[PDB]
Amino acid sequence: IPTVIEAYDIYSRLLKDRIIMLGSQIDDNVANSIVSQLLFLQAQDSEKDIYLYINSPGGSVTAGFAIYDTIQHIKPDVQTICIGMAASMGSFLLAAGAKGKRFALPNAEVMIHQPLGGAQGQATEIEIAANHILKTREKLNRILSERTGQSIEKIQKDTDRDNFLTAEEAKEYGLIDEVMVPE
Amino acid sequence: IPTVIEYDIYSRLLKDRIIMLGSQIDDNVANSIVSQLLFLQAQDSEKDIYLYINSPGGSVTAGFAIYDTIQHIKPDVQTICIGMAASMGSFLLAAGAKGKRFALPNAEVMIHQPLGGAQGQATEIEIAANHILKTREKLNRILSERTGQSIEKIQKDTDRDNFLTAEEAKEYGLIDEVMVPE
Amino acid sequence: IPTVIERAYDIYSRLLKDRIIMLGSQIDDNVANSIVSQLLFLQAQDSEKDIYLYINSPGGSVTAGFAIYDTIQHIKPDVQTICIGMAASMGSFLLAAGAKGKRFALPNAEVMIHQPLGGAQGQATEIEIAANHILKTREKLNRILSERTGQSIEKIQKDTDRDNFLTAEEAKEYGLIDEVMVP
Amino acid sequence: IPTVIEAYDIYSRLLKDRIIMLGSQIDDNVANSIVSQLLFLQAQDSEKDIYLYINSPGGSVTAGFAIYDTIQHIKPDVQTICIGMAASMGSFLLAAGAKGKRFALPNAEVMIHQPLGGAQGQATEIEIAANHILKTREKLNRILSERTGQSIEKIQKDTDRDNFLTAEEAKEYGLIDEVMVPET
Amino acid sequence: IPTVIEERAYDIYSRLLKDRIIMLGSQIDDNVANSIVSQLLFLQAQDSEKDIYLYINSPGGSVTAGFAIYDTIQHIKPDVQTICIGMAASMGSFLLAAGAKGKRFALPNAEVMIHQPLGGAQGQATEIEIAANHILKTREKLNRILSERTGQSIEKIQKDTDRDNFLTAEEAKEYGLIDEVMVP
Amino acid sequence: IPTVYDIYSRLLKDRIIMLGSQIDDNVANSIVSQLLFLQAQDSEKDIYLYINSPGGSVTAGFAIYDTIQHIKPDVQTICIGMAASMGSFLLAAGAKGKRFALPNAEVMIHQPLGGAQGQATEIEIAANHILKTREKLNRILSERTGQSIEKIQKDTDRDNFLTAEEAKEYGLIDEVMVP
Amino acid sequence: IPTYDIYSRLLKDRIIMLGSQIDDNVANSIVSQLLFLQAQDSEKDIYLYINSPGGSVTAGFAIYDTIQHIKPDVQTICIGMAASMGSFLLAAGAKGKRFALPNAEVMIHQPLGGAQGQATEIEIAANHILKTREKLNRILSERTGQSIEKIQKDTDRDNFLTAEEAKEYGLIDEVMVPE
Amino acid sequence: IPTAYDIYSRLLKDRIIMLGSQIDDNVANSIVSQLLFLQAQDSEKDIYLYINSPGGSVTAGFAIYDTIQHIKPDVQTICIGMAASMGSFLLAAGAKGKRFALPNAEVMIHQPLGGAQGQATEIEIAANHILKTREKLNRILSERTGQSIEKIQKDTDRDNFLTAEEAKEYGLIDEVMVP
Amino acid sequence: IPTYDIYSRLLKDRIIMLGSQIDDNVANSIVSQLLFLQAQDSEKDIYLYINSPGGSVTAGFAIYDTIQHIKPDVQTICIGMAASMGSFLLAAGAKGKRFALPNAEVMIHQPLGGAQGQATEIEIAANHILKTREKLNRILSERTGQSIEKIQKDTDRDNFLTAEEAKEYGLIDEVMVP
Numbered sequence A: 001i002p003t004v005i006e007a008y009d010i011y012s013r014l015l016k017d018r019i020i021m022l023g024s025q026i027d028d029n030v031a032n033s034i035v036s037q038l039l040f041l042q043a044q045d046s047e048k049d050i051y052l053y054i055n056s057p058g059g060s061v062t063a064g065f066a067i068y069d070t071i072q073h074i075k076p077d078v079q080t081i082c083i084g085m086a087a088s089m090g091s092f093l094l095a096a097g098a099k100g101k102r103f104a105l106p107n108a109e110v111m112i113h114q115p116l117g118g119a120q121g122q123a124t125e126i127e128i129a130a131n132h133i134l135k136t137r138e139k140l141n142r143i144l145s146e147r148t149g150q151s152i153e154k155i156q157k158d159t160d161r162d163n164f165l166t167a168e169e170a171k172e173y174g175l176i177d178e179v180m181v182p183e
Numbered sequence B: 001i002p003t004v005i006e007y008d009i010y011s012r013l014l015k016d017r018i019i020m021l022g023s024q025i026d027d028n029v030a031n032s033i034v035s036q037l038l039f040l041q042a043q044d045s046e047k048d049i050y051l052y053i054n055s056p057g058g059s060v061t062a063g064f065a066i067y068d069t070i071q072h073i074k075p076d077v078q079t080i081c082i083g084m085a086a087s088m089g090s091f092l093l094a095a096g097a098k099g100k101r102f103a104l105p106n107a108e109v110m111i112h113q114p115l116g117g118a119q120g121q122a123t124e125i126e127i128a129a130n131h132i133l134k135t136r137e138k139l140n141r142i143l144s145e146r147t148g149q150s151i152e153k154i155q156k157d158t159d160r161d162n163f164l165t166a167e168e169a170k171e172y173g174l175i176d177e178v179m180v181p182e
Numbered sequence C: 001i002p003t004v005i006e007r008a009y010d011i012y013s014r015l016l017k018d019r020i021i022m023l024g025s026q027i028d029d030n031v032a033n034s035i036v037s038q039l040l041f042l043q044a045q046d047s048e049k050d051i052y053l054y055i056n057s058p059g060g061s062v063t064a065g066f067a068i069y070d071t072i073q074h075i076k077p078d079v080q081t082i083c084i085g086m087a088a089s090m091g092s093f094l095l096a097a098g099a100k101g102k103r104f105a106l107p108n109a110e111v112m113i114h115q116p117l118g119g120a121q122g123q124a125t126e127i128e129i130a131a132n133h134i135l136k137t138r139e140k141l142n143r144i145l146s147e148r149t150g151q152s153i154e155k156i157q158k159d160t161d162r163d164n165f166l167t168a169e170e171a172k173e174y175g176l177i178d179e180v181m182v183p
Numbered sequence D: 001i002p003t004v005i006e007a008y009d010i011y012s013r014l015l016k017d018r019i020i021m022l023g024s025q026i027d028d029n030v031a032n033s034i035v036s037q038l039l040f041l042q043a044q045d046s047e048k049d050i051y052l053y054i055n056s057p058g059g060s061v062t063a064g065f066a067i068y069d070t071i072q073h074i075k076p077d078v079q080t081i082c083i084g085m086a087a088s089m090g091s092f093l094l095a096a097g098a099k100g101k102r103f104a105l106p107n108a109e110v111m112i113h114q115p116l117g118g119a120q121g122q123a124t125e126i127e128i129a130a131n132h133i134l135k136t137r138e139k140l141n142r143i144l145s146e147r148t149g150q151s152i153e154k155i156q157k158d159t160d161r162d163n164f165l166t167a168e169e170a171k172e173y174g175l176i177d178e179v180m181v182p183e184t
Numbered sequence E: 001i002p003t004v005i006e007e008r009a010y011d012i013y014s015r016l017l018k019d020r021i022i023m024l025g026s027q028i029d030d031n032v033a034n035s036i037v038s039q040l041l042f043l044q045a046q047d048s049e050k051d052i053y054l055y056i057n058s059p060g061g062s063v064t065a066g067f068a069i070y071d072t073i074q075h076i077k078p079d080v081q082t083i084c085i086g087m088a089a090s091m092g093s094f095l096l097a098a099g100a101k102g103k104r105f106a107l108p109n110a111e112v113m114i115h116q117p118l119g120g121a122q123g124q125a126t127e128i129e130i131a132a133n134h135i136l137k138t139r140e141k142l143n144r145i146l147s148e149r150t151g152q153s154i155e156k157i158q159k160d161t162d163r164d165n166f167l168t169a170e171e172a173k174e175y176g177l178i179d180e181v182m183v184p
Numbered sequence F: 001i002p003t004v005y006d007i008y009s010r011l012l013k014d015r016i017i018m019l020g021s022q023i024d025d026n027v028a029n030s031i032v033s034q035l036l037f038l039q040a041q042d043s044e045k046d047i048y049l050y051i052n053s054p055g056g057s058v059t060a061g062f063a064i065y066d067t068i069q070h071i072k073p074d075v076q077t078i079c080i081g082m083a084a085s086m087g088s089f090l091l092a093a094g095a096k097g098k099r100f101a102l103p104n105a106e107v108m109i110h111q112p113l114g115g116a117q118g119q120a121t122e123i124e125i126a127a128n129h130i131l132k133t134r135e136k137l138n139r140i141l142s143e144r145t146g147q148s149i150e151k152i153q154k155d156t157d158r159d160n161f162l163t164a165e166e167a168k169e170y171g172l173i174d175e176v177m178v179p
Numbered sequence G: 001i002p003t004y005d006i007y008s009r010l011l012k013d014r015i016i017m018l019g020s021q022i023d024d025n026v027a028n029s030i031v032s033q034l035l036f037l038q039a040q041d042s043e044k045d046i047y048l049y050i051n052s053p054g055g056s057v058t059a060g061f062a063i064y065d066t067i068q069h070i071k072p073d074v075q076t077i078c079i080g081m082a083a084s085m086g087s088f089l090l091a092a093g094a095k096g097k098r099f100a101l102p103n104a105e106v107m108i109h110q111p112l113g114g115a116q117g118q119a120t121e122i123e124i125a126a127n128h129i130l131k132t133r134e135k136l137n138r139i140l141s142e143r144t145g146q147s148i149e150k151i152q153k154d155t156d157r158d159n160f161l162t163a164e165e166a167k168e169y170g171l172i173d174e175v176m177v178p179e
Numbered sequence H: 001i002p003t004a005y006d007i008y009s010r011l012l013k014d015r016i017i018m019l020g021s022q023i024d025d026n027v028a029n030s031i032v033s034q035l036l037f038l039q040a041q042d043s044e045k046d047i048y049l050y051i052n053s054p055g056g057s058v059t060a061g062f063a064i065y066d067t068i069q070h071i072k073p074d075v076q077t078i079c080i081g082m083a084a085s086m087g088s089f090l091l092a093a094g095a096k097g098k099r100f101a102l103p104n105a106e107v108m109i110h111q112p113l114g115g116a117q118g119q120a121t122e123i124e125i126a127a128n129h130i131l132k133t134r135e136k137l138n139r140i141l142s143e144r145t146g147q148s149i150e151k152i153q154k155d156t157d158r159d160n161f162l163t164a165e166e167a168k169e170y171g172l173i174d175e176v177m178v179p
Numbered sequence I: 001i002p003t004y005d006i007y008s009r010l011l012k013d014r015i016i017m018l019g020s021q022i023d024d025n026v027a028n029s030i031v032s033q034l035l036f037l038q039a040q041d042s043e044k045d046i047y048l049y050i051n052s053p054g055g056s057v058t059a060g061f062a063i064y065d066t067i068q069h070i071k072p073d074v075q076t077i078c079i080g081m082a083a084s085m086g087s088f089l090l091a092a093g094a095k096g097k098r099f100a101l102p103n104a105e106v107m108i109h110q111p112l113g114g115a116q117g118q119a120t121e122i123e124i125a126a127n128h129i130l131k132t133r134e135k136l137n138r139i140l141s142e143r144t145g146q147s148i149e150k151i152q153k154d155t156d157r158d159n160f161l162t163a164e165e166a167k168e169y170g171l172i173d174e175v176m177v178p
C-alpha cells in the first residue's frame, strides 16, 4: 500500500477527506476500525458529510450492527457508495446510508440473503441458538423494511436464498437511491 | 476374540440366545443387533433372548431400529446392564420385557437429553431445532411409559447428565431388579 | 458380525437365505452393486416369492440409488420395503419404491425427504452443465415420487425444498409407505 | 459381501451364471479381474452369451481397452446392461457390447466426454503428452463412431464437454440397442 | 489501521485515547486486559476527575483477565462510562454492567448475553475436584457482583444464567445491566 | 498368534482366560463372554484369570468384576508382569485364597483419572460422578483387602507401586507363587 | 522494495502499478490511488501499468467503474501478461491510450467459479455466473468493437494473444515501440 | 508367513518358541501362553526359546521370566542375531547349562530407560520406581551370571555390546553354538 | 540488510540488483527501478547485476521489454549464476555492455510448465508453451547471432556454460577481469 507525503498511507490520506473504505469481510476488528473512524470524523466536524465506500462480502451480524448503530447515532450524514460488491451485511450497511445519499456504481453487485450460523450441543442449547438466529433475522428484516420501503413479508421472501441484484435493480428495490453516472 | 471348537466367542453365545451390545450404537451395530434378533426369532419364537448392554449410547435412529425390533418380535428380550448403560444405552435397557430388565450391582445408568448439531441458514437451523425437540419429546414419552414416571419428571431429570446406581435405576423404574450373585 | 452354523454363515448371509436383504448404510456404487446382485440372485432362486428389503440408510448417490430402483422394478418378485431407524433422502426414495401395498415402516422409524445436493467447479459453461444436470435429476425424482405417492409434482417440489422429517404415520399419510407395522 | 452356499461370495455365484458385475471406477485392477472373468467364461463355454452389468463413473483409457479388446476377441457374445450410470470409459464399454444386445434400464444415465489427463515438464515433454492424449481421443472417437453409427465429427462435437443422456437418448444415439422396460 | 497526523502521528485508537475513549473490540485475554488496564491507569494519571468512555464489542473471554479490568475500573477515581455496540457477551456483559451507575449504555440494536462460566479439567479425581470447586466459587463471586450491579437477587441471576440468555438493549435496561438505551 | 485353535482358544479349553492388555469395552465384552461360556460348560470347576494389564476404563472393569462375583465357579487371579490401576482392582477381585502374583510381578494402585469440559454446572456433575466412583472403588477394595477406606484413599492419592510381597501384605493377593 | 518506497515515488508522477492477482485488497488500493490522483489534479492523465494473471470479477469491477467514473484519462500499459480480469482492465483504459509492449501477452477466457449445495442453490449460482459472463461480454464488446457473439465464442477456452493480435482484436490501440 | 499350520505353529509342535520382536504386553502374553501350553502337553521335555529381540517393556519381560522359572520343563535359550536389553535378560534366564548364542549373535546390556512428566512429587515417584526396577534387574542378573551387583551396575551404566564369546565369559550364556 | 538500505544506496548510483527468482513481484520492482532511473537521467547508463536461477517467462518479458524500451543503455553483469530466464535477461543488455565475472555460471534450457484437464485444454497449453519457446528462441538468436536451429538443439536439455563459453556463444560480450 503506497505512501503519500504532504507521510500518510493512501487510506489515511483519504480519511483526511472524510472517506472511509470498507473493503473486506466484516469482523470485530474491522468494525472497531470503522466505528473509530466514524467517531473521529464526527469529532473533527459534526456537520460535514462522511463517505463510506463499500466493497464487502459481508460477515458478522453483531459487528455489522456496531457500524450500523454508529452511523445512525452520529450527527454527520454518511453517504454509502457500493463499488464491486455489497453482499449480505455489506448490502445491509449500504442501505443504512443517509436517505438520498446511497449510491452504487453501474457494474457493482448487491446481494441479499438470510443469516447463517451454527449450533451444537443439547437439544435445549440448539433451541436457544435457533431462537436467537430467528430473532436476529426478524430484526434485520424489520430494519431493511424501514430502509427500503418494502414490506417485511417481501424482504423475508426475497432473502430466503441468495438474491443477486444489479445496481439498477437495487435502486428499484429501495436499497440505494441512485446509480452513480460517470463524471 | 478367542475361538470355541465344538465359533468366535460371541457367535458361541448367540447359539444360546445371548446378544452382547458392548460398544457405541451406530448404524453398523444396529444392523447387526437387529439381524441377530430376527435370526433368534426365526430359530425359536417362544424362548427368551438375553441382551447384555455395556454401551455409552450413540445414534437415536440406530437405537430406535433396535428398540422397534425388540417390541416387534415375539420372544421376550431380557436386558442386562453390565458396566454402564448411558444415553441410548439406558433407553434400550428400559425397553426390555417388563419384569426382565436387570442391572448388576455396580453397573451405572445415565440418562440425559439428546445432542446434535446444526449449520446453515436460519431456516435450516430452525428445521434442525424442531427435529431434535420433537425427537426429545418422543423419547421422553416412551421413557415415561417404560418407567411409570411422568413426562414432566423425565424432562426435569434429563436436562443434564444424570448418573444412577443400579438401585437408583430400579427405584426410578428403568430396571426391575438388581441381579444378586448366584 | 457373528457367525451362524446350520455350513457357516455370517448373520447377513443367513438372512439372505430367507430372502431378506439389509440396506443399512450410505448408498454408493459398492453398496448398490451388492444390493443389485442380491436382488438378481433372489429372483433367479425363485421368481415368484416376495423379497424383503430392510432400509436403515441416510441416503447417498442418486445414480447408485437408481441402479437399485430400476432392478426392483425390473425383476418379477415383489420387493417389500421395511424402514427401520431412518430412511432419508435416496433411502426414502427406495422405501417408496417397494411393491404397492407392501411398503412398511416401524412405528418410531424416521423418514426424511428433500431435494438433491451436489457440487460444481470450473468455467461458467461447466457450472451451467452441472446445474442443468442436477435440475433434470430433481425433475425425474419428483415425477417418480409423484407416481409412487399419488401427490402432485407441484406438492412434492414444495415439500422437498428443505429437509422434511416425517414420522412413520406421516409417511403413510403422504403415500410413501402403505402401513405402519404396529407391535 | 454376503455368502451363498450351494461357498461363494455373491459375485462368484453370479459368475457361475455368466454374469459379470462392473460396479466401480475402471483401473488396472478392475480391468485385470474383468478380463480374467471373460477368459474364464469363454473357457467354460465358448458359445453361451455373457452378461456384463455396468455401473461405472469411468477411469483409465488403457484399462478400458484391456476390457474392450478382450470382449471383441472372445467367441461368446457379451451383452452389456447399464444400471445407474455409465460414464466416460463406462459408456464406451457399454457401446462395446454385442450389437443388438446393449441395454440400459429406464432411469439409468449415460455420459460421454473427451479424455482428461495431465502433463508436466519441458515444452518437448508437454508436446509429447499432448500428442498422445489427442491421438488417444482420435482412437476412441473412431471406435465409438464404428459402434454407434455416428460420424467422428459428431462424436468430437458431442464430447467437447460433459454430455449427459437419458436411456432413451442413448438408444437414439446408437450407444445401446434397447431400453429394458419393466413388465410391472 | 489508519493514521491521523496532528507533527505527531497517531493510529486511530491512540487518537481516540487522547479524548479519553478506550475501544474494547475483541475477546478478553491477558494481553487485551493488560492494554486496557494500562490505558485506564494512563487516563487517570492524565486527569483523575474527567470521565472515561469504554466502548464494548466483545464475545467475552477469560474471567481473571476480565477481573483485572473490572477491579481497575472500580479502583480509579474517574467515572468510567460503558457503551455497548454490537455485542457484549459473557465477560463482556459483566464489564458493561461494571460502568459508573447512571453511565452504562447500549446502542439500540446492540445485543447483551449473560451465562455461567465455562472451563475444562483433566487429571486425577482430586484435581478435577479442585478445578470444579474453583469454577463454582468463581460463579458465586460473579453472581454476587452482578446482583450488586443490577439490583437483581442472586437467586434470579443464577437461574437466568443457567444457559445462554440473549437480551436486547431494552431488555438489558429492564434487567439493570445498563441505565439507558442511547437513542439516535 | 500361533495355531494348535489359536493359542488363547486352546487355553480357554482348559478354563484359562488371559487378560493381557488395557481394559476397554471390547476387552471387557470378551472377558465377560469367556466367563459366561466357562460357567455354562461347567458351573463347579475353577476358572483361571491371568492378569498383565496397565488398567483402563472403570465401567469396563466393573463389567468384569460383577461377572466374576455373579457366576458360580471360583475365579482364580494370577498377576504376571504388572497389574496396574483397574488391573490391580480385578486382581483383588479373585476368589479369596486364590489370588496370586508371580515373584517379580508388580502391582500399582492409584485413584481414578478423567476429564470434564463445559459449563460450571456440567463440570460439577462430572466431578461429583468421578468422586462417587472413587468412593465406590475404595469401599469394595476395602472389603477385598481388609484395609480401611481411609487408608485406601491415602494410599491411592498418587501412583503407588507394590512388589508381590507388598501386595500380599496389603491384602490384594493371598500368596506369592513360588516355582 | 527499495527506497518513498519505489511505488510511492512513481505514484507522485501519477503512475499506478498493478502487478499481482486482483483481489479485494488490491482493488481497494488501486481505487484509492485513482481517487487520490483525481483529487490532486482532475485534468492530467494517469498511467496504469498492468502485469496480472487476473482475479476476482467484483474486485475488477471496482477498479473498472472507478476508471470510468473519474475525470482524468487512464492510460493502460500491458507489460508481461494481462490475463483474464487483467486483460479486461487493459481494454478499460481511455480509448487511444491502451498499449502493450511488444512481447507482452494477453489472454482472454470466460469466468470460473464454484457452487455447492442443494439443486436450487446450484441453480442460483449458475444463473449468477452466467449473468456475470453476459455483463463482461457486453462491456468488452463496447470496449473492443467485437460482437458479443464473437467474444462468447473466443473466450470459451483460454485464448492467448500476442500484442499485435490484441491490437487487431481491439483490446489495445497500439503496440509500444522503443523510444 | 508360509503354511494346516503356519510355520511358527509347526515349530511349536516340536516345543520351539520364536521370540523375534520387541517385547511388549502382546508378545509376552503369547510367549507365556505358549510356555503354559507346552508344560501342559509334557511337563518333562525341554523347551527351546529362540531370542532375536531389541528388548522392550521390563514388566512384559518379567511376565516371561517368571513363567520360565515357574514351569517344570527346562527352557533352553538360543540367541540368534541380537539379544539386547530385556532380550539379553531373558537370554540369561534360560536353564543353567542350556543358554546358547550363535557365533555372530550380539548381546547388549544397559540400564532401564523411561520418562516422567508432571509435578515434582510425581517425578520423584517415577524416579524411585525406575531406580528400584534397576536394583531388581541387577540383583537377578548377578544371580544368573555370577558377577557382583557392583560390577553389573558399572557395566550397564551405558550401552555395553558383547560378542557371543564375551557373553560366555560374562556368564550371560553357557556355550557358543559352533557350526 | 544494513541501513537508505544498502540497495537504495546503490540505486542512487544507477545500480539495480536482481538477486532472486524472477516472479511478478520482482519484475514489478525491477521495472519501477528502471523507469525511475530513466526519469532521473535519460542518458546515463544503468547497471543491472544478475544472480538468478530464472523464473516466470512473462515476468522476465516485463523486464526485457522495459530494458529495450527506455533510452539509457542497460549494462548487464552476471555474478554467481544466470540460469534460464536469468541468462535470457543477461543476453538482453546493451550490446557491448554484457558481462560475466570469471567464475559465474550461465545455463540455458527450454521452458517448463504444466497442463491438466481435458485433451482440448492440454492442446491449448502445449501450443502456448511451444509458441513461447519459438518466441524465446527467435529473440535469443537476434541477441547472440546464433541460428534458431542451433539455439533449439542447444536448449533441448540443461546446458551449463562457463563465462568464457558464454562469451563465445554470444550471450555476453566480455568476461570481467579484476
Ligand SMILES: *[B]([O])([O])[C]([C][C]([C])[C])[N]C(=O)[C]([C][C]([C])[C])[N]C(=O)C1=[C][C]=C(O[C])[C]=C1Cl
Residues within 6 Å of the ligand: A057, A058, A059, A060, A061, A062, A087, A088, A089, A090, A092, A113, A114, A115, A116, A117, A118, A119, A129, A130, A132, A133, A136, A140
Ligand atoms: B452475511 O453472510 O454477512 C450475514 C448477515 C446478513 C443476513 C445481514 N452474516 C451472517 O449471517 C453471519 C455469518 C457468519 C459466518 C459470520 N452470522 C452471524 O453473525 C450469526 C448471527 C446469529 C447466530 O445465532 C446462532 C449465529 C451467527 Cl453465525
Ligand SMILES: *[B]([O])([O])[C]([C][C]([C])[C])[N]C(=O)[C]([C][C]([C])[C])[N]C(=O)C1=[C][C]=C(O[C])[C]=C1Cl
Residues within 6 Å of the ligand: B056, B057, B058, B059, B060, B061, B086, B087, B088, B089, B091, B112, B113, B114, B115, B116, B117, B118, B128, B129, B131, B132, B135, B139
Ligand atoms: B445419547 O448420547 O446416546 C443420545 C440419545 C439419548 C438422549 C436417548 N444420543 C444422541 O442424542 C445423538 C448423539 C450423536 C452424537 C450421535 N444424537 C442424535 O442421534 C440426533 C438426533 C436428532 C438430531 O436432530 C438435529 C441430531 C442428532 Cl445428532
Ligand SMILES: *[B]([O])([O])[C]([C][C]([C])[C])[N]C(=O)[C]([C][C]([C])[C])[N]C(=O)C1=[C][C]=C(O[C])[C]=C1Cl
Residues within 6 Å of the ligand: C058, C059, C060, C061, C062, C063, C088, C089, C090, C091, C093, C114, C115, C116, C117, C118, C119, C120, C130, C131, C133, C134, C137, C141
Ligand atoms: B440424498 O442425500 O441420498 C440425495 C438424493 C435424494 C434427493 C433422492 N442424494 C444426493 O443428492 C447426492 C448427494 C451426494 C453427496 C452423493 N447427489 C447426487 O447424487 C448428484 C446428482 C446430480 C449431480 O449433478 C451435478 C450431482 C450430485 Cl452429487
Ligand SMILES: *[B]([O])([O])[C]([C][C]([C])[C])[N]C(=O)[C]([C][C]([C])[C])[N]C(=O)C1=[C][C]=C(O[C])[C]=C1Cl
Residues within 6 Å of the ligand: D057, D058, D059, D060, D061, D062, D087, D088, D089, D090, D092, D113, D114, D115, D116, D117, D118, D129, D130, D132, D133, D136, D140
Ligand atoms: B473417462 O473419465 O473414463 C475418460 C475416458 C473416456 C474419454 C473414454 N478417462 C480418462 O480420460 C482418463 C482419466 C484419468 C483421471 C484416469 N485419462 C487417461 O486414461 C489418459 C489417457 C491419455 C493420457 O495422455 C497424456 C493421459 C491420461 Cl490420464
Ligand SMILES: *[B]([O])([O])[C]([C][C]([C])[C])[N]C(=O)[C]([C][C]([C])[C])[N]C(=O)C1=[C][C]=C(O[C])[C]=C1Cl
Residues within 6 Å of the ligand: E059, E060, E061, E062, E063, E064, E089, E090, E091, E092, E094, E115, E116, E117, E118, E119, E120, E121, E131, E132, E134, E135, E138, E142
Ligand atoms: B465468558 O465466555 O467470557 C465467561 C465469563 C462469564 C461467565 C462472566 N468466560 C469463561 O467462563 C472463561 C472461558 C474460557 C474459554 C476463557 N472461563 C474462565 O475464565 C475459567 C474460570 C475458572 C476455571 O476453573 C476451572 C476455568 C476457566 Cl476456563
Ligand SMILES: *[B]([O])([O])[C]([C][C]([C])[C])[N]C(=O)[C]([C][C]([C])[C])[N]C(=O)C1=[C][C]=C(O[C])[C]=C1Cl
Residues within 6 Å of the ligand: F054, F055, F056, F057, F058, F059, F084, F085, F086, F087, F089, F110, F111, F112, F113, F114, F115, F116, F126, F127, F129, F130, F133, F137
Ligand atoms: B486405572 O488408570 O485403570 C483407573 C481405574 C482405577 C482407579 C480403579 N482408570 C480410570 O480412572 C479411567 C481412566 C481413563 C483414561 C480410561 N477413568 C474412568 O474410567 C472414568 C471414571 C469416571 C469419570 O467421570 C468423569 C471419568 C472417567 Cl475417564
Ligand SMILES: *[B]([O])([O])[C]([C][C]([C])[C])[N]C(=O)[C]([C][C]([C])[C])[N]C(=O)C1=[C][C]=C(O[C])[C]=C1Cl
Residues within 6 Å of the ligand: G053, G054, G055, G056, G057, G058, G083, G084, G085, G086, G088, G109, G110, G111, G112, G113, G114, G115, G125, G126, G128, G129, G132, G136
Ligand atoms: B479471470 O481468472 O480474472 C476471471 C475473470 C475474467 C473472465 C474477466 N476471474 C474469475 O472468473 C474469478 C475467478 C476466481 C477464482 C477468483 N471468478 C469470480 O470472480 C466469480 C464470479 C461469479 C461467480 O458466481 C458463482 C463465482 C466467481 Cl468465483
Ligand SMILES: *[B]([O])([O])[C]([C][C]([C])[C])[N]C(=O)[C]([C][C]([C])[C])[N]C(=O)C1=[C][C]=C(O[C])[C]=C1Cl
Residues within 6 Å of the ligand: H054, H055, H056, H057, H058, H059, H084, H085, H086, H087, H089, H110, H111, H112, H113, H114, H115, H116, H126, H127, H129, H130, H133, H137
Ligand atoms: B531394554 O530397552 O528392553 C530395557 C530393559 C533392560 C534394562 C532390562 N527396557 C526399558 O527400560 C523399558 C523401555 C521402554 C521404552 C519400554 N523401560 C520400562 O519398561 C520402564 C520401567 C520403569 C519405569 O519407571 C518410570 C519406566 C519404564 Cl519406560
Ligand SMILES: *[B]([O])([O])[C]([C][C]([C])[C])[N]C(=O)[C]([C][C]([C])[C])[N]C(=O)C1=[C][C]=C(O[C])[C]=C1Cl
Residues within 6 Å of the ligand: I053, I054, I055, I056, I057, I058, I083, I084, I085, I086, I088, I109, I110, I111, I112, I113, I114, I115, I125, I126, I128, I129, I132, I136
Ligand atoms: B527458466 O526456469 O526461468 C524458464 C525460462 C527460460 C526457458 C527462458 N522458465 C520457465 O519455463 C517457467 C517456469 C515456471 C516454473 C515459472 N515457465 C513459464 O513461465 C511458462 C510459460 C508458458 C506456459 O504455458 C503452459 C507455462 C509456463 Cl509454467
